[PDB]
Amino acid sequence: PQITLWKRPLVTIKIGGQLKEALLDTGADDTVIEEMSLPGRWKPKMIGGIGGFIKVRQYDQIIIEIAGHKAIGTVLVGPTPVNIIGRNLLTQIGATLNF
Amino acid sequence: PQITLWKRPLVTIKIGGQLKEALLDTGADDTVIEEMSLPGRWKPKMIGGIGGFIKVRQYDQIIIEIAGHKAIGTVLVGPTPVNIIGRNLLTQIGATLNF
Numbered sequence: 513p514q515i516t517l518w519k520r521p522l523v524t525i526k527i528g529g530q531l532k533e534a535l536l537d538t539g540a541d542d543t544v545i546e547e548m549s550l551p552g553r554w555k556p557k558m559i560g561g562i563g564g565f566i567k568v569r570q571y572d573q574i575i576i577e578i579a580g581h582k583a584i585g586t587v588l589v590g591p592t593p594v595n596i597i598g599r600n601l602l603t604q605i606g607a608t609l610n611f
Numbered sequence: 612p613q614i615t616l617w618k619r620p621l622v623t624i625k626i627g628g629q630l631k632e633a634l635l636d637t638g639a640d641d642t643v644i645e646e647m648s649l650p651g652r653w654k655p656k657m658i659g660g661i662g663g664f665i666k667v668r669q670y671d672q673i674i675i676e677i678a679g680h681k682a683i684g685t686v687l688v689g690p691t692p693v694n695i696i697g698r699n700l701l702t703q704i705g706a707t708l709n710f
């Protein structure tokens with residue numbers, strides 16, 4: 513698809529068999545999701561945004577569907593205000609910015 | 612152009628007579644630039660992201676040149692860790708996300 517930017521680029525994702533809404537975010541290096549349970553072990557990570565830093569849980573090799581495209585990769589879980597799909601998974605679904 | 616997302620989508624901008632580097636950011640509603648002077652009136656605003664909120668100055672009707680494309684709109688100035696071109700100006704240069 514071709515998504516214009518007059519509205520937020522929100523899409524449906526599926527993770528852990530649950531549908532959620534998430535933002536397609538070219539300004540995010542990493543994918544960050546609100547608190548939820550994921551399988552496996554996690555590692556610590558610190559991420560920085562506009563207001564300062566937060567601690568998140570890094571889960572690797574998680575299956576996640578994004579706007580109907582399958583991805584398998586790293587998902588950060590933490591107190592993000594919105595679910596964000598960052599460049600690590602935008603590249604897996606083949607997304608580009610065009611103008 | 613077509614910008615892939617393997618790396619941060621940074622471009623050169625010109626704002627206030629100054630050249631700067633900024634991130635093309637589909638997850639940002641608004642454009643936020645590190646502290647600089649701009650002419651005209653402004654009013655205070657709070658904007659929030661990962662980490663929490665920062666106070667910024669809102670300047671309206673500011674011209675930016677973004678990777679060689681001119682646009683006009685509101686620019687927020689404050690202690691952002693990076694210069695962000697958000698959707699309010701990405702729309703004006705015709706930027707879309709494609710997959």
Ligand SMILES: COc1ccc(S(=O)(=O)N(CC(C)C)C[C@@H](O)[C@H](Cc2ccccc2)NC(=O)O[C@H]2CCO[C@H]3OC[C@H](OC)[C@H]32)cc1
Pocket residue numbers: 535537538539540541542543544559560561562563594596598636637638639640641642643658659660661691692693695697
């Ligand atoms: C109302 O108008 C705005 C309100 C909020 C923002 S924002 O900057 O807070 N942000 C909104 C989303 C969080 C919903 C835009 C977002 O693209 C920022 C843009 C950004 C980028 C760098 C620093 C600050 C902000 N990215 C970000 O926070 O990235 C974090 C989490 C994802 O992994 C890392 O990627 C970069 C950063 O690691 C340095 C980590 C912008 C305009």
Ligand SMILES: [Cl-]
Pocket residue numbers: 584585586600601
């Ligand atoms: Cl990944």
Ligand SMILES: [Cl-]
Pocket residue numbers: 683684685699700
């Ligand atoms: Cl605007």
Ligand SMILES: [Cl-]
Pocket residue numbers: 516705
């Ligand atoms: Cl359009």
Ligand code: NA
Pocket residue numbers: 551552553571572573574
């Ligand atoms: Na894992």
Ligand code: NA
Pocket residue numbers: 650651652670671672673
């Ligand atoms: Na003005």
